[PDB]
Design a protein around this ligand. Structure first.
Ligand SMILES: CN(C)c1ccc(C(=C2C=CC(=[N+](C)C)C=C2)c2ccc(N(C)C)cc2)cc1
Ligand SMILES: CN(C)c1ccc(C(=C2C=CC(=[N+](C)C)C=C2)c2ccc(N(C)C)cc2)cc1
Ligand SMILES: CN(C)c1ccc(C(=C2C=CC(=[N+](C)C)C=C2)c2ccc(N(C)C)cc2)cc1
Ligand SMILES: CN(C)c1ccc(C(=C2C=CC(=[N+](C)C)C=C2)c2ccc(N(C)C)cc2)cc1
Ligand SMILES: *[C@@H]1O[C@H](CO)[C@@H](O)[C@H](O)[C@H]1NC(C)=O
Ligand SMILES: *[C@@H]1O[C@H](CO)[C@@H](O)[C@H](O)[C@H]1NC(C)=O
Lengths: 531, 534
């Protein structure tokens, strides 16, 4: 047996596996349990710590994926399938993964913890895009990723009940963070240098750990890629969550205790079958079961918590891809398709705005339409299509990110910001979608270093830069290379100068103001309109 | 007759006139000044529609300008050309309904396209005798026949008790119409062509031209129109009947006064008493608002200009319309705290928010909020230079640029040939501070060709420029097309259309075609802000 692959954590002994990365080997410990399986009577309940086990637990293979929607619309289409479960589904899914250098690091090593996205209804830490071997092998990082419960299983809430209090999916993530604190030193990891990073719902999750005090003792730095805890999709009120749970119960044949009991009798796939049917409006970029403002995990709305919080001793990296909104249009807006250019009419544009801004009044939707129309080409289908994409991306990601950045920076945080502008040469989504939601991730994780993946040389070199930025941030709270070139420097985001950088094949370029005029509209004016 | 110059004697419907031979830089022109076209609207005629001048006997001397209609005179800045060039330059009187005619000398042998100028001044001031409206250059250089009339302003021109016999409103516009009619009947005596008449005017004068386009009885009196920095639609050029009634009733109270009794009492007040109080009846603290303006009476204006431009057939109308680069700057020093002509007028964010309420005086809190958020630069929300300039743009866009863009849009969509410009040259002689840019009113001296007078110290470039402009305007008056049919070489001026939205820059450089008349911003003013009002 290889000593390198044998590790004792508090629960018992594990055996991992030597994996091949392009530059040499890494030690990988996959499918480590961190919670009692949340099954039967534990459905909807907070996670409990995993009981100690005997002998040597095999940790050479990924565990099951938490029960979720599986996309079948386009069999064999990489653009969808790459996000689908790549192991069997099960409610028994609370496992985490650890990659380290081989041999184990000599000194304590900064740790990166990945929290995946997928609208809080989907995702797994086992997807190929989340493979930690490149970061471990090239940058020497200890990289951790956990499964957390998604959909009803993870966020169905009857607020105030003891058996379905909500947010148990975020409690799963927190327990995984507790586990890293307790155990990661045995892998060569430094528990005193832990960086969370995540994308979309994963980024929103990261932000919710920033805003939830018991999580703050578990990490030191944070990265939010294309998502935020604030904004229109990442949380619901207690009353809306109650409504959604109650309707879903009705839809599958069911006081809180009796209602949750009957829910616990239903096959997992019955809940997934009706998951979406409880959304109040015809919408896109809306997910039925998400974190709930409970007065507990979230003491208040994220909007309220980022406005009033002290973020003095926090470092944060945040950013967006060039085309945040395009991916979502094909899931609900008539006229849009992955299989044609989706050149839409003006009528389709006004109808699309109601779907992409589902909570907007007639008057508010009117303001959006008039702001995003180009009045020199008010009927040009191509402008209208690109405008539809912009409406959804700004409302849901870019302006919530600008809002968070400025609030953090103003209240003491050290903030770095980016826009990612390179379209992967290998993308199977059509060209009109540009740089879609989620297609920076593979570069950050360093997938282009895998020659068999048929990326370009430029892309390999790009990925190495991004791995450096991110691991420099994790080591130091600053993405800049602490000695090497130099330059141009990546400056901190501030309210005065509002500087951010472009991440693309050319060298860093510093820009100022993140959709400043347009996010003023979303962030300062439209709210005055509801009010 | 007998020993007089025989080429200066002329008969019109009311009798014989003697004009005067004037010197223009390049030669003589004929001028017939101070021709009466109405009975003096004095005494019991105050506030009433004009009556046509009854014929006179003998030869009326028409060699000097007549009285200016009774109005406010600006006295704030002793010896300041910037205000003084606009002030009355002849005696103030209610007896003021005269017009002026310039032609070549000798008079033209064949019928000659006529231009009629309608002055601005917020409907509370102005005169056809100001130096800046001098017809001699257009007459001499382009062979134009140019007419300009006085029309009543302020209370005397626009005070209304709508529905009354004695003060029906809009009599100032009727003064203008009477002059147009006078031209139809009489201009042929001077060699003008009554079948080719182009109105042009600036600010309230442009708004006036617009109202003649929109009032059916005026339509037979002209063929083509020019609207410089003004429109009949928009926030300032008209009031409702209700609001005009309110303003006249308040004014009456303030000077110590059944409509008949009320109006009768107003007619006993000294003219200067009315002038002394006319500004006191405005509903809000404001700039670019005037108490006594055309009223939507359901007569001269059958409906609001907005409704009329939205639904009118304009198929056989040619129009030329435009703006100066800085429409709003001039109005800020008249009542937005923080602005002066005598300093750079850098302002704070607080003064900007305050100024937006004064400059958009009918905006609700939410509307004002939308304005401030649109015009704020969020990379530099506190920069006092950006804020000063934004204040100016708010006031300019709201009052002129976007009303002009609405007008151009509707006319183009509803059959008219439209030509649009922006005028971007600042007179080397301007006495207003530099921060004001090209302010409201300061294209006019170039259109009338003042720079051709060497004694005015304009540059050579400005003299060449004035000549280009005099050609655009007079080609437009002749053909409905500003383009020179012989200079096919020079860059062309395309029509404004809804599909391409082309307009040109007027400056020292050759014509440049641009697309979209402040298109995004005017979408806010013209499409969104109204939907908010509801
Ligand atoms: C109009 N209406 C009531 C709808 C419309 C669509 C759905 C969707 C659905 C999901 C799972 C299903 N089963 C497992 C049987 C069946 C349907 C759905 C929604 C969003 C989505 N994505 C955004 C990926 C994918 C699928 C449900 C109700
Ligand atoms: C990847 N991609 C572009 C997709 C993927 C999935 C869908 C939707 C869908 C497809 C197959 C289903 N089953 C086999 C059960 C259930 C739902 C769907 C979503 C919304 C919707 N409405 C809002 C009416 C209707 C259908 C659409 C686009
Ligand atoms: C606040 N308030 C009650 C006001 C404010 C300003 C005035 C103005 C005024 C004019 C002439 C007067 N007399 C002949 C005695 C007296 C006052 C005035 C207004 C505008 C203006 N311009 C825009 C040029 C010039 C003057 C009157 C009342
Ligand atoms: C040319 N220029 C920049 C001007 C011109 C006029 C004024 C105003 C004024 C000046 C002299 C007056 N008289 C000699 C009778 C009466 C009123 C005035 C305007 C507004 C106002 N308020 C809004 C209170 C008060 C006074 C101001 C600036
Ligand atoms: C794309 O395809 C869908 C259906 O497959 C269709 O409804 C839509 O009109 C198409 N769009 C274009 C631009 O052809
Ligand atoms: C200029 O105008 C007046 C001075 O009368 C004052 O209120 C304003 O603050 C001044 N602004 C400057 C000096 O920038």
């Amino acid at each position: 047996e290889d000593p390198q692959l044998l590790v004792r954590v508090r629960g018992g002994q594990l055996r991992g596996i030597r994996l091949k990365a392009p530059g040499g080997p890494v030690s990988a410990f996959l499918g480590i349990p961190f919670a009692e399986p949340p099954v039967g009577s534990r459905r909807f309940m907070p996670p409990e710590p995993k009981r100690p086990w005997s002998g040597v637990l095999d940790a050479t293979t990924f565990q099951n994926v938490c029960y979720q929607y599986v996309d079948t619309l386009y069999p064999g289409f990489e653009g969808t399938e790459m996000w689908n479960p790549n192991r069997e589904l099960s409610e028994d899914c609370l496992y985490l993964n650890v990659w380290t250098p081989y041999p184990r690091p000599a000194s304590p090593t900064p740790v990166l913890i990945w929290i995946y996205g997928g609208g809080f209804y989907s995702g797994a830490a086992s997807l190929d895009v989340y493979d930690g071997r490149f970061l471990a092998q090239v940058e020497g990082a200890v990289l951790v990723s956990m499964n957390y419960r998604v959909g009803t299983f993870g966020f169905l809430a009857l607020p105030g009940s003891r058996e379905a209090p909500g947010n148990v999916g975020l409690l799963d993530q927190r327990l995984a963070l507790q586990w890293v604190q307790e155990n990661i030193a045995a892998f060569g990891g430094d528990p005193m240098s832990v960086t969370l990073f995540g994308e979309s719902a994963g980024a929103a999750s990261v932000g919710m750990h920033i805003l939830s005090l018991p999580s703050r003792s578990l990490f030191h730095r944070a990265v939010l890629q294309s998502g935020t805890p604030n904004g229109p999709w990442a949380t619901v009120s207690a009353g809306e969550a109650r409504r959604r749970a109650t309707l879903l119960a009705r839809l599958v044949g069911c006081n809180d205790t009796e209602l949750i009991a009957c829910l616990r009798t239903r096959p997992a796939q019955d809940l997934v079958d009706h998951e979406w049917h409880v959304l109040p409006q015809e919408s896109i970029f809306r997910f039925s079961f998400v974190p709930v403002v409970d007065g507990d995990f979230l003491s208040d709305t994220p909007e309220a918590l980022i406005n009033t919080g002290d973020f003095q001793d926090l470092q944060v990296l945040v950013g967006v891809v060039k085309d945040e909104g395009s991916y979502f249009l094909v899931y609900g807006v008539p006229g849009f398709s992955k299989d044609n250019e989706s050149l839409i009419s003006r009528a389709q544009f006004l109808a699309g705005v109601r779907i992409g801004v589902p909570q907007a009044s007639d008057l508010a939707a009117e303001a959006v339409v008039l702001h995003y129309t180009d009045w020199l080409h008010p009927e040009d289908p191509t402008h209208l299509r690109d405008a539809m994409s912009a409406v959804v991306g700004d409302h849901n990601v870019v302006c919530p990110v600008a809002q968070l950045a400025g609030r953090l920076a103003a209240q003491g945080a050290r903030v770095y910001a980016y826009i990612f502008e390179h379209r992967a040469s290998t993308l199977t989504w059509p060209l009109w979608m540009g740089v879609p939601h989620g297609y920076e991730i593979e570069f950050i994780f360093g997938l282009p270093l895998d020659p068999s993946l048929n990326y370009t040389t430029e892309e390999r070199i790009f990925a190495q830069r991004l791995m450096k930025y991110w691991t420099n941030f994790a080591r130091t709270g600053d993405p800049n290379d602490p000695r090497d070139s130099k330059s141009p420097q990546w400056p901190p985001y501030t309210t005065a100068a509002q500087q951010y950088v472009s991440l693309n094949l050319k060298p860093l370029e510093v820009r100022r103001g993140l959709r400043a005029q347009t996010c003023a509209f979303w962030n300062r004016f439209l709210p005055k309109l509801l009010s």
